[PDB]
C-alpha cells in the first residue's frame, strides 16, 4: 500500500538501477506482456501467435518458460491473468479471445474462446474473475461474462469512444475502469453501472492515447499518448497535475507504447523509441532521472512493471522479451 498521493522522498530504485536478468525469444515481434496479480508470473505474446508463461523466480535464479500456448493464428495483442484461477485470457488479431487453463504443463490449446467482430486490442479481467473488459478496433467497449459468454455494453451509446480502444484497465477496487482510445480521449467508467463518468478530451493534444492506468489509491490516472508525453491526471478535478516530458522524436509518428508506474509508484517509466531506452521520471515532481539503456535491437511496444517487486518486462519488435530486476 505504498503509492503516489500528492494530497498527502521516494522508496524504490530508479529504472537505471535495474538489470536484465533473463532474455526470452519469440519467432516474431513481441508486443504484449502482463503480470499475474501476485506478481510471480509473466505472460508474453507475439506476432508468431504464441504465448509464453514465465516464472519470475526462475528468471532471478529448471526452465523459466514454464508454459507455451499455441491457440491463435495471428498476432496476440493482449493478455490478462485470471485473478484466482490458473487461467490466462488472450486476445488476438485473429478476432478471438482465448481462455487457457495453464495448471497442466502439457496444456497447449485454450478450453473456451469468444469469436469477436473486431481485432482485440486490450483486455482487463475483473478482479472477481467473473468478467472481462474487452477493447477492440471497434469504438464500443465490451463486458463479457466469463461463465455465460454473454456480452454487455453501456446503455448510453454516447458514452462510447469514437475510435479503436487502445487500453482498458480496472482500478484496484473494481469500482472504476479507464480506457484510452485512438480518438484521443481518456474515459473514466463506473465499474458497476458501466457508464462513462468522465471524458478527458484531447488528453494528449489530439494524438492517440496509448495507455491509461490507475494509481493504487485510484486518485490518479497515468496516461501516455502519441505526443510522447506521459500525464498524471487527478480524477477528482479532471485535470493534469504532472507532465512527464522528454521522450519521443520529430518527423514521424511514434508507435504505440505504455507509460507505467514502478511497484511503489515513485517513478513513471516510458520507453523511448528514438534511443531504445527507458525514460524515467520522479512521479511526484516530473524530475527526469537516469536513462535506462534497454539493450533491444528494435522498438519496445510493451512494458509491464511488477505490481509487487522492482521488476519489469520489456517486449520488443526484435522478437525478444527482457526481464528486468534491481538485484
Amino acid at each position: 500500500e505504498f503509492g503516489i498521493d500528492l494530497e498527502f522522498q521516494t522508496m524504490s530504485p530508479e529504472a537505471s538501477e535495474y538489470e536484465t536478468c533473463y532474455v526470452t525469444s519469440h519467432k516474431g515481434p513481441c508486443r504484449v506482456a502482463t503480470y499475474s496479480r501476485d506478481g510471480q508470473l509473466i505472460a508474453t505474446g507475439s506476432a508468431d501467435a504464441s504465448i509464453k508463461i514465465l516464472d519470475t523466480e526462475r528468471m532471478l535464479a529448471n526452465h523459466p518458460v514454464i508454459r507455451t500456448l499455441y491457440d491463435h493464428v495471428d498476432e496476440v495483442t493482449c493478455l490478462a491473468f485470471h485473478p484466482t484461477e490458473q487461467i490466462l485470457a488472450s486476445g488476438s488479431r485473429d478476432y478471438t479471445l482465448k481462455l487457457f487453463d495453464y495448471s497442466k504443463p502439457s496444456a497447449k490449446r485454450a478450453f473456451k474462446y469468444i469469436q469477436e467482430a473486431e481485432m482485440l486490442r486490450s483486455i482487463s479481467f475483473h478482479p472477481s474473475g467473473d468478467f472481462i473488459l474487452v477493447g477492440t478496433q471497434h469504438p464500443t467497449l465490451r463486458l463479457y461474462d466469463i461463465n455465460t459468454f454473454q456480452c454487455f455494453v453501456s446503455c448510453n451509446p454516447q458514452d462510447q469512444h469514437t475510435d479503436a480502444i487502445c487500453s482498458v484497465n480496472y482500478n484496484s477496487s473494481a469500482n472504476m475502469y479507464v480506457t484510452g482510445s485512438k480518438d484521443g480521449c481518456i474515459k473514466l467508467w463506473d465499474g458497476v453501472s458501466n457508464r462513462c463518468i468522465t471524458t478527458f478530451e484531447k488528453a494528449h493534444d489530439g494524438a492517440e492515447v496509448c495507455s491509461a492506468i490507475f494509481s493504487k489509491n485510484s486518485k490518479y490516472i497515468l496516461s501516455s499518448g502519441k505526443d510522447s508525453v506521459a500525464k498524471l491526471w487527478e480524477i477528482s478535478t479532471g485535470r493534469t497535475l504532472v507532465r512527464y516530458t522528454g521522450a519521443g522524436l520529430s518527423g514521424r509518428q511514434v508507435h504505440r507504447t505504455q507509460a507505467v508506474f514502478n511497484h511503489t509508484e515513485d517513478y513513471v517509466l516510458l520507453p523511448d523509441e528514438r534511443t531504445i531506452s527507458l525514460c524515467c521520471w520522479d512521479s511526484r515532481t516530473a524530475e527526469r532521472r537516469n536513462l535506462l539503456s534497454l539493450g533491444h535491437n528494435n522498438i519496445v511496444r510493451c512494458i509491464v512493471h511488477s505490481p509487487t517487486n522492482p521488476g519489469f518486462m520489456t517486449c520488443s519488435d526484435d522478437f525478444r522479451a527482457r526481464f528486468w530486476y534491481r538485484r
Binding site: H126, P127, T140, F152, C155, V192, S193
Partner: peptide, 14 residues
C-alpha cells in the same frame, strides 16, 4: 469487489 450490474446494461452481439 463489487460486480458489474449487467441489468443496468444492454446485451451486445458482435
Amino acid at each position: 469487489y463489487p460486480k458489474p450490474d449487467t441489468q443496468q446494461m444492454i446485451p451486445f452481439q458482435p
